[model samples]
Target: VPATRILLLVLAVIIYGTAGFHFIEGESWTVSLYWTFVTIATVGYGDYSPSTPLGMYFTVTLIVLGIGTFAVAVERLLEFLI
Candidate 1:
C-alpha cells in the first residue's frame, strides 16, 4: 500500500489550496500558499480575508475542512514523528 502520510499530505495540500483561495489576496500562487499556511496555523494576522458573503461562507467551510485535514495530518505526522 501507499504511504498513509503521503496521502494525508495530499489531502492537506488540497484543502490548503482551497484555504489559499479564500485567505490569500495577491496575484501570485506563492502568496496564496503563504496565506494558506497562515490560516492553517490560525495566525489570521487580520491582513487578509474573503470579502464577499459567499467567500465568507466558503471561509467557514474552509475552516472546518482545513481543521479536519490538519487534525489528520498532525496525527499522521506524529506517527512519523515518533
Candidate 2:
C-alpha cells in the first residue's frame, strides 16, 4: 500500500510538472517542475495553466491524481500519528 501510494504520488507529480510544457510548451524543466509543485499544492497564484486540449486533459487527470496522492500521504501520516 505504501509503495502503491508513492508510485501514484510520483505519477501525479510528473503529470503536473510536465503540464507547463503543454501550455508554455517551451519552458525549461525548472519552470515546468516549479509550476508542478505550485499547481499540486493549490498555490496557483495565477502563475501557470494548461491551455491546450491535451493539456486540459492532463490538468483534470493530474488534479484527480493529486487528490489521491494527498490522501495516501495523509493516511500514512495519520497512521503514524496515531
Candidate 3:
C-alpha cells in the first residue's frame, strides 16, 4: 500500500496548505488551494502569495518536510569498484 500512502500524503499536504493560507490570508478556498499547489510544486507564479508571518512560516515548514530530503545509497556497487 505504499502507493496509497503516498497518494494520501500528497492530499494531506494540499489540504494543510490550503487551510493555512485561507485563514491567514483570507483568500477564497479556490484561490488558497491554487496557491498551495503552486507553492508546493515550487512553480511560484507570483500572482498570488502569502502575506502573514504565520503563512510564511508554514510555507517554510512545508518546503523543509515535503521536499527536503532525497538520497540514493549503494553498497554492492562500491564492492564492484573496490
Candidate 4:
C-alpha cells in the first residue's frame, strides 16, 4: 500500500536528514536528530542553524521533501475520511 511506502520513505528521509545535519553542522547525533525533527515539523526554534552554504542547501532539500511527504500523508487521511 502507498501508506506503508510513505511510512518507509519518511523514515528514510528522517535518517538521511539526521545524518546530513550531523556531518554538515558537526553536531552530536542527538542534536542533529532533534534539529531534523524540528526542521521537518516546521517548528524551527532558531536554536540551531546551518552556517555553511552547503548545509543551507541540504536543509532546503530536507524541508521540501519532508513537508511534501507529510502533505501526502495528510491528503491520504482526508481521502479516507471523506
Candidate 5:
C-alpha cells in the first residue's frame, strides 16, 4: 500500500503536469500527457519541448522536484520488492 501510495503521488504529479503543459503549450491533452511522461522519464526525444517561459519554468521545476520524488518512490518500491 505504501508503494502504491507513492505511485499514486507520482501519478498525481503527472496528471498535474499534463494540465500545466496543456495550458502552457496549447497542446492536446494526449500530447501534454505524452510530454509529461517523456520529460519525467528523462527520455526527452527533442520532438516536443517547452518554448514558452512558463512552460520552461514548469519543466525545470518538474524536473527538479518530480525526478527526486520519482527516484525515491522507485527506490522504495525496489526495496519493498526485495
Candidate 6:
C-alpha cells in the first residue's frame, strides 16, 4: 500500500511537470511529457529546457520534488522485490 502511494505520487509529479511545461514553455503534450521525464530522470538531454525565469524556477522545484519522489518510489519497489 505504501509503494502504491509512492507510485501514485510519482504519477502526480509527472502530470504536474507535464502540465507546467506545456503551459509555461508552450510545448505540445508529447514534448512536455518527454521533457518532464528527462528532467525527473536527470538526463538533461539538452534538447529541451526552460527559457524564462519563472519556467527555470519551476523546473528547479520540479527537479527537486520529482527526483526525490521518484527515488523514494524506486527504493520502495526494490525493497518490496528483495
Using TM-score as the measure, the top candidate is 6
Query: What is candidate 6's lDDT per residue for 5-62, written digit by digit as tens?
Result: 9999999999999999999989999999999988898889979999999899999999
lDDT for 51 (candidate 6): 91
Error of 6 at 26 (Å): 0.4
Lowest lDDT 10-residue stretch of candidate 1? 18-27
Candidate 1: where are CA atoms >4 Å away? 1-27
In model 4, which regions exceed 4 Å deviation? 74-82
Worst 10 residues of 5 by lDDT: 65-74
Question: Which sequence of candidate numbers ranks them by lDDT, best first?
Answer: 6, 4, 5, 3, 2, 1
Please give the TM-score that candidate 2 achieves against the real structure: 0.59
Candidate 5 local lDDT, residue 77: 78
TM for every model, in the order presented, reads: 0.63, 0.59, 0.74, 0.81, 0.81, 0.88
Tens digits of lDDT, candidate 5, 1-82? 4878888888888888899999988999999998888887788897889999998999998898677666767788789789
Name the top lDDT candidate. Answer: 6
Please report, in order, the local distance difference test score of every candidate based on alpha carbons: 0.61, 0.66, 0.69, 0.87, 0.85, 0.92
Model 4: pairs clashing at backbone N, Cα or C within 3 Å: none
Clashing pairs in 1: none
Q: Residue-wise lDDT of candidate 1 within 1-82, one digit each (tens)?
A: 2358656664766655654574543325665666565666567885666677766665676667675665566666677769
Per-candidate RMSD vs. true structure? 3.7, 3.6, 8.1, 2.8, 2.3, 1.7
The superposed Cα distance between candidate 1 and the true structure at residue 80, in angstroms, equals 0.9
Number of clashing pairs, model 3?
Answer: 0
Q: Taking the tens digit of each residue's C-alpha lDDT, what string does model 2 give over 12-71? A: 666655754645556667777776666666677756676678677767776776756755
- Clash statistics: count for each candidate: 0, 0, 0, 0, 0, 0
Native-vs-model 6 lDDT?
Answer: 0.92
